[PDB]
Design a protein around this ligand. Structure first.
Ligand SMILES: *[C@@H]1O[C@H](CO[C@@H]2O[C@@H](C)[C@@H](O)[C@@H](O)[C@@H]2O)[C@@H](O[C@@H]2O[C@H](CO)[C@@H](O[C@@H]3O[C@H](CO)[C@@H](O)[C@H](O)[C@@H]3O)[C@H](O)[C@H]2NC(C)=O)[C@H](O)[C@H]1NC(C)=O
Lengths: 199, 95
């Protein structure tokens, strides 16, 4: 009779480079048909057992008459999002499966501080811009282990933020600063930025 | 072409696909309000048989909606199955 879904599409979380499979199960499909739509950019992916998109990483598979599979190989971060399995009943029936594509942190040297020099008592902002999914946290600490000095100024052994803002610099504050970028997706990364303070 | 098509209730609407078909890629129509897949090439997915995809020799496609009703008004999108897609919208106005 009227086709219906068996369970719900299971949602997946993979690092980039892995393969994602979304299974859409239907009972009594009859003469109806199953289509796939990528929801983020409303792109038709497949219709029945045929792939529509010329994206060569995406395919569809059908063995058990009830289960319709969407496969995305070598997951890219832009594949993240939800995927609609449509049954052409009237009114339409649909389920959605979602892909979380995790990306490990990466610090961009172009948009991040290189070794810099400042005159004593001047200001100096160190900055590490980071990419990743989830968006990576950025932590600033001194390689030698001394506490950084920022407004309460006060002594902290770590600062969370992309831009470490140092002002009224004194001679003690010269040396190597680490910015660590992490998002619980391994591996965390760090950039080593060296600050020199002239008299 | 045009992104605004006006059609009297009860007459056939012809929605231009304002994007050119490239090579052997497919041409598909979707309804934007619900994401409902309508046509893929000449295959009609939606059960409503007033919907028809017309393939022209010069690679410019058309979505025909026979006997337009008020409920048909809204935005439609033509898309060519490159990755990323090439797409163009059409507002159908019913009068
Ligand atoms: C995979 O994820 C989908 C989607 O989940 C939701 O949307 C995402 C964008 C995220 O924001 C998620 O955090 C968010 O929860 C799950 O689908 C949802 O499943 C529930 C079932 O618990 C659906 O609710 C029901 O709908 C049925 C009919 O379909 C009714 O009979 C029930 O009474 C109940 O209302 C809900 O509609 C559905 N949402 C969508 C958009 O599809 C899905 O369950 C999940 N997969 C698994 C295996 O958990």
């Amino acid at each position: 009779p009227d086709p219906e879904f068996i369970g719900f599409i299971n949602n997946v979380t993979y690092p980039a480079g892995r393969e994602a499979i979304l299974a859409c199960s239907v009972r009594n499909l009859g003469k109806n048909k199953v289509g796939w739509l990528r929801a983020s950019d409303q792109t038709v992916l497949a219709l029945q057992g045929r792939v529509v998109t010329h994206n060569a990483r995406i395919s569809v598979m059908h063995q058990d008459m009830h289960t319709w599979k969407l496969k995305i190989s070598k997951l890219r971060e832009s594949d993240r999002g939800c995927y609609m399995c449509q049954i052409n009943t009237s009114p339409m029936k649909k389920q959605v499966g979602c892909i979380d594509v995790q990306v490990p942190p990466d610090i961009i040297n172009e948009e991040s501080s290189a070794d810099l020099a400042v005159q004593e008592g001047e200001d100096a902002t160190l900055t590490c811009k980071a990419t990743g999914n989830p968006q990576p946290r950025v932590t600033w600490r001194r390689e030698d282990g001394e506490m950084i000095l920022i407004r309460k100024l006060m002594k902290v052994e770590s600062y969370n933020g992309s831009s470490l803002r140092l002002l009224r610099l004194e001679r003690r504050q010269m040396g190597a600063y680490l910015c660590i970028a992490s998002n619980d997706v391994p591996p965390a990364v760090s950039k080593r930025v060296s600050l020199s303070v002239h008299h | 072409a045009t992104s605004n098509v006006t059609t009297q209730i009860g007459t056939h609407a012809y929605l231009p696909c304002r994007v050119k078909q490239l090579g052997n890629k497919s041409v598909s129509w979707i309804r934007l309000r619900d994401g409902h897949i309508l046509t893929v090439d000449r295959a009609v997915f939606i059960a409503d048989q007033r919907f028809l995809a017309i393939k022209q020799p010069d690679k410019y496609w058309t979505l025909q909606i026979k006997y337009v009703q008020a409920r048909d008004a809204g935005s439609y999108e033509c898309q060519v199955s490159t990755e990323p897609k090439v797409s163009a919208r059409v507002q159908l106005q019913v009068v």
